[PDB]
Assembly symmetry: C5
Homo-oligomer: 273 residues x 5
């Protein structure tokens, strides 16, 4: 049938269908996703007063991000279950178009909150040295936006036009590297003039940041990481994508936020952990 | 097919249908919309105590507006997905009337909260000089209401009766200019007798106000901004409209609110920024 | 078609149908309704500490009322859209009985919260002189209940049995007048021994109370206020009814609550307006 | 139609159907139910600080109960409207089995929260004299559970097996009397050594407790209180049952909680009424 | 019918169907489940300040767990009612595949929150002696994850491949024993150097922990605990499973959390129990 500029899930769903395990796992992992986020929201609110006033914007922005991620991951969980329906005769879930086609683009546009705010929020915990606060912020936000928007365009074509897919993906990748560059700078300047404890945390944060954020382009490419007609262009690839998103999401948002909160505590004049 | 006094989305949806990208983007952008608003709600609540008591009503009214905008943008997101359904044979989303016709009027009536409160809330941060508080408030609220109501009538006719569309739109425009007039006055008087920092912010606020509020009549006209049978009388126009609303909404509500909060901090005896 | 003891909306919906504008407006105005209430809830909670402890129960009861009204107006918004479905052939929304018949009775029973609490809450702001607190409360609550219950019975018959409609309506009206009587007493005793500012507010409150509460029996009668086969026994009447309810609801609950809060501030030893 | 071990509502719904008034009222009264509970939740949270620390657990447990009752009464409201659908030809609502059969058992299992917590919470306000706190608590909780569970079994058979219905009901009744016994003791010991004001409240509480709790077995029996083929084995009985539950629910939970809160205030060293 | 790697509920549902009592009870018990959790959330938040600051993370993590469990138990309640639909002709609820197959796997992945956090949270109340905080945490979290993941795989095969079911189950059991081991250690070291009161509570906690956590593998095995074609491979088994989960859930999460909170109070320098 005619699907157009649609994500590859819909093509697997339309031709092969999804096994019980594939369908159910994808459902479960998204559910866990949004559950984590709402739990995180509660955590971050409830721990605001654990750090000095000046650090508390970090907690607030964590919370802001949790709201975004919850809403999206919740919405997307429902989108999954609507888009694919059990066929009794063969015993697999197939594309149910009355439910709309499944699209990962929901995530992308919601990153226009998540990404800016996640990058922003560190600047409230660490002190810069040679770099200017506003300058860093603006670079983060610009490159962030450009990264997302270009990627957002790309992913529409991941099946329909593999060239556009990769080119847009490439362009996106450029801006991603820019962000990585700037964040490294930030983390180094952050380490300057703070206890060894805080420096250890920032080291961890950087590793977390680097891995977790890298997963996202991983998910982008997921169906094609085993080349043409590969293992991953399958229900197995579908599962993998949503798993990776969920790991990325938990890492890049919740754990990131927790570490920052721990950093803020060390840097806090009253407070101890 | 008889549609009557219906928005142009329904006509595009009924004749041409929407591509994957068009349908999905519109869906995504509204989702982002309401996500932003609920995140904003949390922000504004959580930052109430960042400013002196006398300023805190600004935070509260921001919050009030966020609730309104969330509920509406959420409701409207659902309305979009209900009103247009995938047709397998051609691979486009077409008007599904069992879901009701799509209408932008939801926004308009909900502005009867948003507009009054947004205009009101500045009067709790800035001090007037030559203008009377009650006088400004009453002018805002009257012209606000008249603007919205006349526009609300107009938009029902954007397809069915182009004349009514434009005339009502014109009348609305009058009241809009009145508001612009009064807000300018407010901003100027606001700048009098406050730090240069606060004056810079109010300068920014005015630019934000002017652009963001102007987008709304832009969205009004969107289908016809490329004239008859133009580029924008199409799924491309539909997308554009909802994008512009979302940019307007985020600018005029969230960012506006944030700037005011920053102003309130500068004006605050305790606090610095 | 056999509808029985049903509200007149269902008869208009079943015979003539509703135009786009009629259906959409009714939908919009209810949406605005419940939006206002949830915004109000936030306001009243967030402003508790703006008045002296003894007054804060007024804020709490406002909040209680907002919860009720939100839930109801939300539920009723959904009931509207479920009860009437677009017919493609003629281009009007007709009764969809699979969605249940539309009934205004939802409002009425929910008044068993709203009315008692709204009458109650003033007694926490004003001081009585010659009247006993418990006595006033009991008169309010009794007459309130009797008003609502009798009206609730009436409205089931507004089409099926015009006599029952009017008789029950009459009986209700009696109890309504009793309430008006007692509230006037309260307002006068309230004015005794308080500043001219507070007296001005109570004057306004009384006018608000009188008009806003009177709208409700206005809505009761709405289909018949232009007599038989009148202008208002039509989709135009349907719109009018729900508009009037929404104006009444906002006036009698939110604005009422705001004014009381303003009164409480004047009467507050610390605080000024 | 084979219905089996189902509540009598489903039998009325399946044979006679429900009139507009019957269906709509049942819908309204459940809606009011859950509205009241959520309003109560807000109240009890918002008034925590109105009593001395030692009493505040009463407020918290009230709140706990409100959450339970809201969720259930909400869920049950939706169950009602799903289970019965308008038939156009005769103009009555009939059993719609695609919506599941209606069952009152939802209430019962949720009492496993409500009952224990309601009995518990008084023990935080009154001081016992003769009796041991833990001892009373354990008797309450055991007899509570046994009451509910036996009743829960009973009500499945209220149509299918009248004998089982009554026997289980009887057994339940035993445990109920035990609770009444213990609560009386508690209330008497509570009155010992406190002001006459507080003693008056506890007198009221006991009357409230006794009536409100007794309604519940009243609702159990409701269809059969006018014997076989009686007035109440009808849509009129259905209405009655849900009305009685709602009165019971509001009395036994909200009002009960309010009175306890008032008692706590009198007993409070700081505070006065 | 072809069901594949599906839970046994779906097989009972597809062949025998569920009686009124079976279907309704399963529905009720899940509803009670999620009700309990949301009530718990409120409790744990509202009692944060009953213990010394250092203990309050226990309250917060309890709360985190409640959010998770609520969302899941809620989602699963809805999944139950969607997956099984009344058949009029025979009067039983049968598998409705348009609702998706029922799967218990939702629980399992959500344990990836619950388990880590429940194990973690004790380490904020007790002081270790010979064991290292980080060491215990890491063992808990690793073995926890491995337990869940292996079990999660197992349960997909509980019908389709009894061998895989048991093997994976066995592997899981290994990791479970490891956790039991570590928790015992923790409890003993916890008891060292604290009051007799605190020691009593930890004794209770251990018993609670041991029983409640053991129920979960009980539920795993439930359909087969009466061997082949046993009593429990039936609607009776289905009921039993969900009952056991609910008991487990309330015990292992809510009561566990309460006891820890009580412990924290005894250990609290300010406060008394
Ligand atoms: C700016 C980057 C725009 C890159 C867009 C790529 C266009 C493209 O790939 O066109 C393929 C062609 O249609 C045959 O496959
Ligand atoms: C598409 C645009 C994305 C919208 C971005 C955030 C929405 C959530 C609102 C949170 C606003 C945070 C702004 C902020 O953090 O500013 C701190 C302030 O400047 C120091 O006092
Ligand atoms: C301040 C209050 C505004 C009062 C009246 C505005 C009347 C505006 C009505 C404009 C309707 C124009 C119209 O309907 O056009 C005529 C014809 O149908 C085209 O083909
Ligand atoms: C008070 C609201 C007034 C409502 C006024 C509605 C006027 C609508 C209008 O302008 O008429 C256009 C139509 O095409 C002409 O037949
Ligand atoms: C962004 C919105 C502004 C206008 C949208 C830009 C035009 C649509 C972009 C596009 O991809 O056009 C292809 C077609 O609309 C679908 O396949
Ligand atoms: C078109 C694409 C724009 C999308 C994201 C930009 C992210 C920026 C949104 C953040 C808004 C918060 C804000 O404006 O804060 C100002 C503050 O004063 C600063 O220090
Ligand atoms: C007590 C009031 C009862 C009024 C009943 C009523 O008005 O009945 C009208 C009659 O049925 C018209 O034919
Ligand atoms: C049957 C329909 C009737 C439904 C009505 C119940 C309203 C529900 C919740 C409001 C919470 C209860 C509010 C009661 C206030 C009583 C009060 O405030 O008196 C003590 C005061 O606190 C001294 O300080
Ligand atoms: C103690 C448990 C005994 C309670 C069980 C009662 C069962 C019952 O009432 O059976 C009636 C009889 O089967 C009518 O034909
Ligand atoms: C058919 C039944 C009709 C139902 C509608 C009837 C109205 C009842 C409304 C609220 C009751 C709330 C319970 C409050 C009871 C305690 C009131 C109280 O204690 O009085 C205030 C006190 O004097 C100040 O400190
Ligand atoms: C320790 C962690 C993983 C163990 C890895 C080994 C996994 C062993 C799984 C055994 C299995 O899957 O069983 C096959 C089934 O019996 C065919 O009929
Ligand atoms: C992660 C590895 C997935 C393990 C699943 C393998 C399995 O146990 O499948 C049973 C049997 O081999 C298939 O019919
Ligand atoms: C909480 C969400 C986060 C941190 C999202 C991060 C997203 C990215 C780092 C996306 C990166 C991409 C590329 C660099 C290539 C493909 C397109 C993107 C946008 C997925
Ligand atoms: C948060 C929502 C806001 C700030 C809405 C503002 C709306 C306007 C400024 C609307 C203006 C209009 C015109 C001036 C012409 C066309 C009709 C309107 C109402 C869209
Ligand atoms: C917030 C809701 C309020 C204030 C509701 C007030 C309702 C009334 C004043 C109803 C009055 C009625 C009559 C006096 C005649 C017809 C029957 C009623 C109940 C609508
Ligand atoms: C908030 C809910 C409450 C207070 C529920 C109370 C329930 C009862 C007192 C039930 C009593 C019953 C009998 C004594 C006989 C029939 C079976 C029961 C459980 C309905
Ligand atoms: C709040 C949820 C909790 C405490 C869940 C605990 C889950 C377990 C202890 C699961 C144990 C299992 C086995 C040891 C064997 C079968 C597979 C599992 C995962 C059910
Ligand atoms: C293309 C999207 C534009 C991104 C906006 C980020 C610019 C940063 C401006 C911030 C000024 C405070
Ligand atoms: C799923 C494992 C991650 C795949 C790594 C591929 C990332 C490519 C990033 C390009 C920049
Ligand atoms: C739809 C395009 C409208 C953009 C308006 C830009 C605002 C300019 C006001 C200065
Ligand atoms: C003292 C105990 C009195 C309690 C009254 C309970 C009556 C319940 C019966 C149901 C009401 C009759 C409806 C027809
Ligand atoms: C099966 C019903 C279990 C009831 C749990 C209700 C959830 C709220 C938990 C409150 C626990 C109350 C104990 C307080 C004692 C602390 C002093
Ligand atoms: C500072 C905190 C350090 C935490 C370390 C704890 C690590 C626990 C993470 C568990 C990851 C388990 C990976 C399982 C691999 C999948 C194998 C499944 C068998 C088929
Ligand atoms: C850097 C990673 C990008 C690798 C691109 C792999 C190219 C895959 O190629 C595509 O594989 C699909 C899956 O079977 C086929 O259906 C398509 O016809 C084919 O174009
Ligand atoms: C200020 C901007 C208003 C300009 C009005 C443009 C006139 C549009 O003209 C309209 O275009 C529609 C779509 O192309 C056609 O379907 C209509 O028949 C036509 O009247
Ligand atoms: C206080 C105002 C009450 C006025 C009562 C007027 C009764 C109107 O009369 C009614 O009008 C309906 C609508 O046209 C008709 O359908 C009814 O058959 C007719 O009885
Ligand atoms: C304590 C009060 C218990 C009285 C129970 C006796 C009434 C049982 O009467 C029942 O009435 C039903 C409908 O009316 C009939 O369908 C049953 O056949 C009949 O047993
Ligand atoms: C306690 C853990 C081991 C239990 C293994 C019991 C073996 C169950 O055996 C299974 O029972 C099903 C239900 O009757 C049958 O339908 C299957 O054919 C059979 O494989
Ligand atoms: Na599905
Ligand atoms: Na759709
Ligand atoms: Na509709
Ligand atoms: Na129905
Ligand atoms: Na069902």
């Amino acid at each position: 049938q005619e699907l157009g500029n649609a994500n590859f899930e819909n093509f697997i769903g339309a031709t092969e269908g999804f096994s019980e395990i594939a369908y159910q796992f994808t459902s479960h992992i998204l559910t866990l996703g949004y559950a984590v986020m709402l739990a995180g929201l509660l955590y971050f609110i409830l721990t605001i007063k654990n750090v000095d006033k000046k650090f508390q914007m970090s907690n607030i922005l964590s919370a802001v991000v949790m709201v975004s991620a919850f809403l999206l991951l919740y919405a997307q969980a429902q989108n999954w279950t609507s888009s694919f329906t059990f066929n009794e005769e063969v015993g697999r879930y197939f594309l149910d178009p009355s439910g709309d086609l499944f699209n990962n683009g929901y995530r992308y546009l919601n990153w226009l909150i998540d990404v800016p705010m996640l990058l922003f929020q560190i600047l409230f915990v660490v002190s810069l040295t040679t770099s200017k606060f506003s300058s860093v912020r603006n670079q983060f936000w610009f490159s962030g936006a450009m990264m997302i928007i270009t990627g957002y365009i790309g992913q529409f074509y991941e099946v329909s036009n593999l060239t556009a897919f990769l080119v847009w993906g490439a362009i996106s990748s450029a801006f991603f590297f820019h962000i990585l560059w700037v964040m490294k700078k930030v983390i180094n300047e952050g380490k300057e003039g703070i206890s060894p404890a805080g420096q250890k945390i920032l080291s961890n944060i950087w590793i977390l940041f680097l891995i977790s954020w890298t997963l996202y382009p991983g998910a982008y490419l997921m169906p094609y990481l085993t080349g043409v007609d590969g293992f991953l262009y399958s229900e197995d690839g579908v599962m993998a994508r949503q798993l990776v998103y969920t790991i990325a999401d938990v890492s890049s948002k919740v754990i990131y936020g927790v570490l920052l909160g721990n950093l803020a505590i060390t840097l806090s004049k009253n407070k101890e952990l």
